[PDB]
Tab-separated table of C-alpha atoms and ligand atoms in Angstrom:
chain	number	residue	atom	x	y	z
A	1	UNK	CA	0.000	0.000	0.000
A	2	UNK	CA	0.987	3.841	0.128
A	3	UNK	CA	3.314	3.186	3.086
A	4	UNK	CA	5.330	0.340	1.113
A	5	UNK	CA	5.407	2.506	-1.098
A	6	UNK	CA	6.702	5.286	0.304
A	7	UNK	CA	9.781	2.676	1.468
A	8	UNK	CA	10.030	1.307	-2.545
A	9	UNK	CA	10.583	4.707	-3.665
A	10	UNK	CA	13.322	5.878	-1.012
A	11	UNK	CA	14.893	2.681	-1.495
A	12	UNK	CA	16.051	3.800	-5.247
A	13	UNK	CA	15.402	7.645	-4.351
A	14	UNK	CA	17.607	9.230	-6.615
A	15	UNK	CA	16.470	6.862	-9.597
A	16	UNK	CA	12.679	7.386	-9.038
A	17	UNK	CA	13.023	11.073	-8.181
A	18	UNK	CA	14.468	11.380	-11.216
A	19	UNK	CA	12.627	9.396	-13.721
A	20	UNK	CA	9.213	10.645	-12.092
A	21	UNK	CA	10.405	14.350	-12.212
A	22	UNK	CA	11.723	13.883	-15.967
A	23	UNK	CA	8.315	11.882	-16.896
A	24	UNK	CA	6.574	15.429	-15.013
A	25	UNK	CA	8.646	17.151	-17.768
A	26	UNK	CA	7.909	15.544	-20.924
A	27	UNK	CA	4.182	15.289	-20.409
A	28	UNK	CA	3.996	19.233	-19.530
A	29	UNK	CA	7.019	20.936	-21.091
A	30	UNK	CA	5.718	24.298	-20.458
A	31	UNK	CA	6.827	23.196	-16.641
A	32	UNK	CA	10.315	23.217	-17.928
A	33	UNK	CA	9.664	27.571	-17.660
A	34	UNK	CA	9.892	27.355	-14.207
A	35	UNK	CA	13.094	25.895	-14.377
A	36	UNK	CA	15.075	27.710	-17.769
A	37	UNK	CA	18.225	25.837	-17.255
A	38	UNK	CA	16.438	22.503	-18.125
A	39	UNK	CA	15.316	23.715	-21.651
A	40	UNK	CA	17.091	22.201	-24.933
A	41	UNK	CA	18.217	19.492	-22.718
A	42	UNK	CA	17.613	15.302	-22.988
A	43	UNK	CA	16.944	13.197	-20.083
A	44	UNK	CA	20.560	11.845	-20.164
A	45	UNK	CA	21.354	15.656	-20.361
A	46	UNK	CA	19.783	17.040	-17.188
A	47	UNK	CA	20.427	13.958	-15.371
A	48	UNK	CA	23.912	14.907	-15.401
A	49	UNK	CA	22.799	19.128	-14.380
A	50	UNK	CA	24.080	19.127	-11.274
A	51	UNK	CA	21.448	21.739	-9.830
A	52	UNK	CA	18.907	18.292	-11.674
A	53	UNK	CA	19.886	15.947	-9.362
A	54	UNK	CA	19.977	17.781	-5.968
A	55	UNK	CA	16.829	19.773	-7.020
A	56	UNK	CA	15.131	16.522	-7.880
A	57	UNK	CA	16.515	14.535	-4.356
A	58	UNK	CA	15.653	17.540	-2.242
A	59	UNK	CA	11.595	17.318	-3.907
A	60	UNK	CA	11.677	13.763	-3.801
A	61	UNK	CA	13.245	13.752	0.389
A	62	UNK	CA	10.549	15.896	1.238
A	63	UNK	CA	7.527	14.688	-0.716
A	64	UNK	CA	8.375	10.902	0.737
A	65	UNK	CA	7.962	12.934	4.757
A	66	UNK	CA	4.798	14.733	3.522
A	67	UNK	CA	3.445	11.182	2.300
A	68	UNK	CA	5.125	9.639	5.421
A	69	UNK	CA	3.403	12.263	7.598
A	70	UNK	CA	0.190	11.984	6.152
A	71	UNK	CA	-3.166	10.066	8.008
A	72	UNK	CA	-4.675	8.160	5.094
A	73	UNK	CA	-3.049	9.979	2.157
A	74	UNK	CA	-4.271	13.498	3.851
A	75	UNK	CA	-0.840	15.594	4.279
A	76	UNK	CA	-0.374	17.433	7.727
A	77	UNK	CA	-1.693	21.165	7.073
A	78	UNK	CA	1.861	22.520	8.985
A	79	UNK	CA	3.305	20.587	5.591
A	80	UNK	CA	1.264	22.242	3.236
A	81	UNK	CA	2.235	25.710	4.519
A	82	UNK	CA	5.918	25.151	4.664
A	83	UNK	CA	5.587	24.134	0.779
A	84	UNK	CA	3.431	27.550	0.238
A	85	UNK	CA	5.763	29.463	2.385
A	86	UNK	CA	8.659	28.468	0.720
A	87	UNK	CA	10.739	31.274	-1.191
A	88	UNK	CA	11.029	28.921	-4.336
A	89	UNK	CA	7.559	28.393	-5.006
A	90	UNK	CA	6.778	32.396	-5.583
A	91	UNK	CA	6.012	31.630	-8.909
A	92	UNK	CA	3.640	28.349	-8.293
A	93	UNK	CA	-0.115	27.526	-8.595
A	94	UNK	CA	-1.402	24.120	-6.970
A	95	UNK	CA	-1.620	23.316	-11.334
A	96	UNK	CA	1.958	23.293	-11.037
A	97	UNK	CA	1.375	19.851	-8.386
A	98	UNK	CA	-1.603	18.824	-9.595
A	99	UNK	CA	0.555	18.225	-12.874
A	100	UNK	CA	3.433	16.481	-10.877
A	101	UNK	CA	0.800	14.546	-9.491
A	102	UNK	CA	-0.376	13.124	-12.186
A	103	UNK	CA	2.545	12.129	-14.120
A	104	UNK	CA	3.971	10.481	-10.639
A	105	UNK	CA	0.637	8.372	-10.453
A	106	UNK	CA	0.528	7.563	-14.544
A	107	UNK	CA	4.383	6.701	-13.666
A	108	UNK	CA	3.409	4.401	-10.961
A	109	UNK	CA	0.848	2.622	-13.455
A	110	UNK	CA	3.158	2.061	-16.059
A	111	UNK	CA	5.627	0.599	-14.082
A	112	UNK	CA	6.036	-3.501	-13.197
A	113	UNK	CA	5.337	-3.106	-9.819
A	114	UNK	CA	2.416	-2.985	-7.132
A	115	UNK	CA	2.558	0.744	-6.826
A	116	UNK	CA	-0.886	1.685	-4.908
A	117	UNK	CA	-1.232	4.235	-7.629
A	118	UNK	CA	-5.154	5.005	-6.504
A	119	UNK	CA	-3.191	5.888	-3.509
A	120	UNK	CA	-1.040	8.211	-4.825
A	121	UNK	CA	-3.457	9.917	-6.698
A	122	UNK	CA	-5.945	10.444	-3.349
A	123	UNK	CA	-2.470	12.116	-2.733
A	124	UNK	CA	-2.178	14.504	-5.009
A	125	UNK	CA	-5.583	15.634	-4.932
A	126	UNK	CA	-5.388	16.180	-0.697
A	127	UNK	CA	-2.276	17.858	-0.903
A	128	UNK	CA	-3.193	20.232	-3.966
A	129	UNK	CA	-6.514	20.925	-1.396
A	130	UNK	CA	-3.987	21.229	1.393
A	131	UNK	CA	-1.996	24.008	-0.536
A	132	UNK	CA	-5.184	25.757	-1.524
A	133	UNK	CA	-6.342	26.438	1.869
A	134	UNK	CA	-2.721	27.196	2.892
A	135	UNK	CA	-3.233	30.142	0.481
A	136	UNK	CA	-1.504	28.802	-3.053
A	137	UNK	CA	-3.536	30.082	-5.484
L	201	HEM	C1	5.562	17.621	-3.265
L	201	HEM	C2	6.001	18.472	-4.213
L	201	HEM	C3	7.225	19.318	-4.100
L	201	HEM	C4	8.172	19.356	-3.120
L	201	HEM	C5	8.221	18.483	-1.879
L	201	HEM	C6	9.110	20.366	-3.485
L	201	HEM	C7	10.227	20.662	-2.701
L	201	HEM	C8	11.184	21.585	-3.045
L	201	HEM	C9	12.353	21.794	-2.302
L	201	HEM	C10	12.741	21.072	-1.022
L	201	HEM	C11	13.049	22.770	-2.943
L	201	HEM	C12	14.366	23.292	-2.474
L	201	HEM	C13	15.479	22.438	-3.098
L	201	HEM	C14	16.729	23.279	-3.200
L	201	HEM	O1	16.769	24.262	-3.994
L	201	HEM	O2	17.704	22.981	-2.475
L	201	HEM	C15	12.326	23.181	-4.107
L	201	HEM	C16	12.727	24.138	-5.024
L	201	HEM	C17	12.009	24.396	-6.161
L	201	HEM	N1	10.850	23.792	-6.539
L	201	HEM	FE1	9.890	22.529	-5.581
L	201	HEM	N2	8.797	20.953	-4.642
L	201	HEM	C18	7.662	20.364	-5.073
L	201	HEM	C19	6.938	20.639	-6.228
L	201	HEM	C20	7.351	21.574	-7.172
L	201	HEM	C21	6.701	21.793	-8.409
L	201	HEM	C22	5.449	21.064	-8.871
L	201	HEM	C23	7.415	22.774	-9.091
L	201	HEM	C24	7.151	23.348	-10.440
L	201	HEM	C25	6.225	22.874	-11.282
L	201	HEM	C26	8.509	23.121	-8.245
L	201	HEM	C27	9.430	24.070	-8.553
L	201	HEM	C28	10.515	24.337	-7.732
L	201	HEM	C29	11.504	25.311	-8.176
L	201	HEM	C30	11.432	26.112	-9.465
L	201	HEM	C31	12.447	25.356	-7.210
L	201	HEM	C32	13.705	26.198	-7.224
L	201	HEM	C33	14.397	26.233	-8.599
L	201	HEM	C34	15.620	25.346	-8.717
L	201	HEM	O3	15.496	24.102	-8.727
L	201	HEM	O4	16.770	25.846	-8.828
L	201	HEM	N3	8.450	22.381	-7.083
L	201	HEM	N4	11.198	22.414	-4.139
L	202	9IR	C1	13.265	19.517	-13.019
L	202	9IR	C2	13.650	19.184	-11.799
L	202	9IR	C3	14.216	17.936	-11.521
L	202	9IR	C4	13.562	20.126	-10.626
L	202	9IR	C5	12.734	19.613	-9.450
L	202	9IR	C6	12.748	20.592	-8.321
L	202	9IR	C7	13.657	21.524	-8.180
L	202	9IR	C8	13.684	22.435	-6.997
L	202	9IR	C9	14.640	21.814	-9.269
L	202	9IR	C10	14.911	20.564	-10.089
């Protein structure tokens, strides 16, 4: 279930952060704005952007405590502010996750494994509400 889950993932971190955060990329590559330094780049490219890799741990670290956190896929409200509050996410509307969201879940689907993608996606949907009512607009 979600919790396994949550130990699959940081088991391989660095592997899934990155092949969820590149599949985030290639289904919405308007995302790619947010982050210029990623444009006119492969996947083999960025994954050797230093900035890519750290970036893409740091998201990953902290989205695995948010899920770990979480009662029944619903994230801690003190979570979703720190994500609203922080400095780096200026730019961001909760479109911004719900698109993360859904490439993580599709992701999960694809792959050969028991993923609890229903799960995930309950996920991505509470913590996109969570962010709202934190005041992301
Ligand atoms: C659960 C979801 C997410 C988590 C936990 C998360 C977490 C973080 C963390 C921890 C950092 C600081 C890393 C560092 O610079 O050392 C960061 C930076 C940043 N995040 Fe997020 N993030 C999430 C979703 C997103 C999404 C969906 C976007 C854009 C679509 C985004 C855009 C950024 C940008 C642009 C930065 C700084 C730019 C850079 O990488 O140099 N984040 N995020
Ligand atoms: C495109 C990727 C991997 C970015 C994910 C999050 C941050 C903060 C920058 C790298």
């Amino acid at each position: 279930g979600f919790k396994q889950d949550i130990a699959t993932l940081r088991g391989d971190l660095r592997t899934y952060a990155q092949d969820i955060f590149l599949a985030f990329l290639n289904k919405y590559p308007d995302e790619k704005r947010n982050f210029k330094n990623y444009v006119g780049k492969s996947d083999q490219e960025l994954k050797s952007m230093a900035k890519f890799g750290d970036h893409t741990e740091k998201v990953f670290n902290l989205m695995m405590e948010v899920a770990d956190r979480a009662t029944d896929c619903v994230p801690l409200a003190s979570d979703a502010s720190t994500l609203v509050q922080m400095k780096q996410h200026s730019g961001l509307t909760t479109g911004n996750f719900e698109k993360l969201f859904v490439a993580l879940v599709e992701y999960m689907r694809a792959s050969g494994q028991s993923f609890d993608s229903q799960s995930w996606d309950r996920f991505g949907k509470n913590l996109v509400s969570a962010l709202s009512s934190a005041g992301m607009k």
